[PDB]
Amino acid sequence: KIEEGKLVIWINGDKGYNGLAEVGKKFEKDTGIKVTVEHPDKLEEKFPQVAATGDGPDIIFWAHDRFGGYAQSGLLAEITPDKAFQDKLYPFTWDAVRYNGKLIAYPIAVEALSLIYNKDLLPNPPKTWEEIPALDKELKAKGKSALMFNLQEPYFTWPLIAADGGYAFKYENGKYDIKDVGVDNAGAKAGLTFLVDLIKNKHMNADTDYSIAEAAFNKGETAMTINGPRAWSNIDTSKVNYGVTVLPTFKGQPSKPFVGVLSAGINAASPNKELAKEFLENYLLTDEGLEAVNKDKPLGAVALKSYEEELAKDPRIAATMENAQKGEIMPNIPQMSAFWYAVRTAVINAASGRQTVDEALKDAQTRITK
């Protein structure tokens, strides 16, 4: 069981967890309530396992796409902030955490992937994905490469797959059709074929992950990378002269990144629900609270209107929002977990050459509509 009179918080290890730990220390000085911040590996998978038994953290942080599945299993408490508190966050961020008409989380920040480039290697970023093979050929002649990014997580390849027609679930009439899936369609095959051809032609390696791409870019070995807000702090330290901009178009269509709203849910088994609420509304969801996390690892565009006005001046945040406006808020429906696992498998098999693109996407389509 969860201990009473204390707060345990789980947040991903790529977030500003030290910063969040500081907001917890502030809460503890004022109220006497100890706050413990942890970042278990695979917490988005572990949470449903432990929460099912009345264990786990009092508060869990993740993008909103996972939350409909948790709420469906009865693992999240319904939150009911008063209208006054609600008016402080952007309306659309509240929409991302509404499930079956109920609020199941507090929206924290908005994030989308962007194109990041080394201005010393590339004064101007490519406008199309199609010109990258040629950029790479010339950069290779100088000992560098054009682009390196995480190919192990479908989140990073999805903008290209969706660019010319790929989609997860058909949204229509204020509802998602869990039977109308678009991973096996023409647009999706075109996008993933482009990706697989980059690897075949030696422009990228199928095994590239987050650390391999980060190391290469921050070292000045590659002219471009694709990443989210959290990557910015480490690039700042690298002293690389970088720019953050809009992703390239594919077949003349803009890349469409999935947009995630970092959110905070309260475990339905938690005996400390009123403490969690006090912490979230009066300590974390304040200019001071968000600034502390943001300083540890950039949150992106925050849900709190008052603090977002100040961050909006940052060109990196502008680029982030521009990429978001071209993408799509991820669905929060329970089927999202099956979508993500099926698309991860498809991308890795196709990229590693274990299956062809058609075989890979066909299996995913089948799995998701099961």
Ligand X SMILES: OC[C@H]1O[C@H](O[C@H]2[C@H](O)[C@@H](O)[C@@H](O)O[C@@H]2CO)[C@H](O)[C@@H](O)[C@@H]1O
Tokens coding 152: 């192990």
Residue closer to ligand X by CB (options 99, 155) is 155
Pairing label, strands 167-172, 102-103:
unpaired
Residues 6+ apart with CB under 8 A from 181: 167, 168, 169, 170, 339, 365, 368, 369
**340 contributes a contact to ligand X by CB under 6 A:** yes
The residue count for binding ligand X (CB under 6 A) is: 12
Which of 2, 20, 63, 269 touches ligand X by CB under 6 A?
A: 63
Taking CB under 6 A as the binding criterion, the range among 71-79, 150-158, 239-247, 351-359 that sits at the site for ligand X is 150-158
Residue 122 contacts residue 223 (beta carbons within 8 Å): yes
Residues 6+ apart with CB under 8 A from 46: 40, 56
Site for ligand X in 28-57 (CB under 6 A): 44
Which of 14, 38, 180, 207 touches ligand X by CB under 6 A?
A: 14
Nearest-angstrom CA–CA distance, 342 and 350: 12
Residue 160 contacts residue 190 (beta carbons within 8 Å): no
Residue closer to ligand X by CB (options 49, 306) is 49
**155 contributes a contact to ligand X by CB under 6 A:** yes
Site for ligand X in 75-114 (CB under 6 A): none
Pairing label, strands 175-182, 249-250:
unpaired
Beta pairing partners, 59: 9, 266
Give the x-and-dash track for 226-265 against ligand X (CB under 6 A): --x-------------------------------x-----
Residue closer to ligand X by CB (options 254, 260) is 260
Taking CB under 6 A as the binding criterion, the range among 76-84, 85-93, 131-139, 152-160 that sits at the site for ligand X is 152-160
CB of 209 to ligand X, least distance (A): 10
**208 contributes a contact to ligand X by CB under 6 A:** no
Which of 2, 17, 27, 66 touches ligand X by CB under 6 A?
A: 66
Residue closer to ligand X by CB (options 90, 340) is 340
Residue 139 contacts residue 223 (beta carbons within 8 Å): yes
Taking CB under 6 A as the binding criterion, the range among 30-38, 62-70, 131-139, 232-240 that sits at the site for ligand X is 62-70
Q: Sign of the CA dihedral 99, 101, 103, 109?
A: positive
User: What are the φ/ψ torsions at residue 314 (nearest 5 degrees)?
Assistant: -70, 120
Let me know how many helices (H) and strands (E) the chain has, helices first.
16, 17
Binding positions for ligand X, rule: CB under 6 A: 12, 14, 44, 63, 65-66, 153-155, 228, 260, 340
